[PDB]
Design a protein around this nucleic acid. Sequence first.
RNA 1: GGCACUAUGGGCGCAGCGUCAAUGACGCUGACGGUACAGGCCAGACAAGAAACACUUGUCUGAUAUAGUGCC
Lengths: 215, 226
Amino acid sequence: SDIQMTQSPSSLSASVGDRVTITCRASQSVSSAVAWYQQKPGKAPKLLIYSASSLYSGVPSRFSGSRSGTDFTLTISSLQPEDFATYYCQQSYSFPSTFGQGTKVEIKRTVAAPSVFIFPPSDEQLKSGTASVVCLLNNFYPREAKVQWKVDNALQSGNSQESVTEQDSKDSTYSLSSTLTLSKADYEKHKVYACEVTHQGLSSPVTKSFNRGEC
Amino acid sequence: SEVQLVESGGGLVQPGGSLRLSCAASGFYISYSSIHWVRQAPGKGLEWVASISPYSGSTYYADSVKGRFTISADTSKNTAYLQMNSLRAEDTAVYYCARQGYRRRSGRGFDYWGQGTLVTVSSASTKGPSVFPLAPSSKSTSGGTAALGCLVKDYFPEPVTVSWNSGALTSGVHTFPAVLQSSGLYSLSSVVTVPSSSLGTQTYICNVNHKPSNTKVDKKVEPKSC
RNA sequence: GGCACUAUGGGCGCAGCGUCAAUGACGCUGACGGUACAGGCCAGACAAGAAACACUUGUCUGAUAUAGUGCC
Ligand SMILES: [Mg+2]
């Protein structure tokens, strides 16, 4: 069997000065052949811990590794601003090697509700046979955010796609973009296009809607 | 300090095709180390691919590539190789080569990694984007500011570049990560928030540049009113 | 996997016969089979060697073993 490495949490919000503990659990014994890696967006990973608890040379002393059986924990004693990154455990006990899925450490801030915007399809687009409806959720925190499309109150599945920005470097909020893609024929079979946004900063889910053919 | 790894040989390739990546080592003799390949699909995590052992040349492969990929080394060139055969869209990833360290210094951790080379497997042809305004209006207004944008739609391959007002407008811009549609073409949107009081006075033009297809498109985005 | 019991042609017995990276092992059948030993070979785990494997050199275990059965 392949040894599974599964990390926890998959994402973690902290602030500078926080003690952080990331765990990883091998699906079988991997003895002590476990490495931890830090990766920053757009850059290649860097080794932190080898043999599960040895600080890799040149790595700051606030990082440490720890082992009990198949339980592996990377902890950062006091998070510094360069520690926001994705971290990976790896087992090299046996071939084939395995990485865990990775734990993202993001910057904690106060809760911010998305301002929610909707955009009907362009006329230029409708001429082409496609209808794209775009919902923007702007500058919110935290990142968890349910975006739900309704077309004449029918819940939509399988025809929307989302993208999220990285945490903003200055206000460390997020922004998300959901697009409903329809054929032009489908778009003209309905009236009320609605974006329902569900988020921690809102007292109750916010909706933005338009009627196809509104001035 | 002088240890370095340089991947090369990446590119576009059709499904079922083949590609050979290289890994130029420097600062050390490649004969005395284990060399690995590690890949990262866009937006996903690390995935170990293959490795080769010193002195024996023994090779190891991940299940998802067994029987298609071959790692090897040419120690006279100080280079490692990854031959990829009958590639599939799932193989699209940034491919890293990594050095496992010396046992007594860093166990089996990978102590040096190249910066990776990108492999894209797709049936898609080269195709410039269609650009569509995301017109500002009520329904895109929040008090003092209005949101507006451009939908950059149905292009291949990555990347596009999007600027506002020929670069002059930068604050408030979110250009979203592109999403890969089931047609195999990409799509992104770019939006900027502005003072709603300026919608009548300032023009806004998203500039979309797609060098693969050698296309440049400027869309004026105008308010929708009634 | 452990515990108790049973038995043991070197872990490698002879002689043919087949497979394999063949001064090796592996499987067949036949015949034979009182002991002890000793080398040597070999197998298994491991250590170090720029070394997860393989290679080299060394170490430990091969009746404290290994088959069978019963039991947990
Ligand atoms: Mg029985």
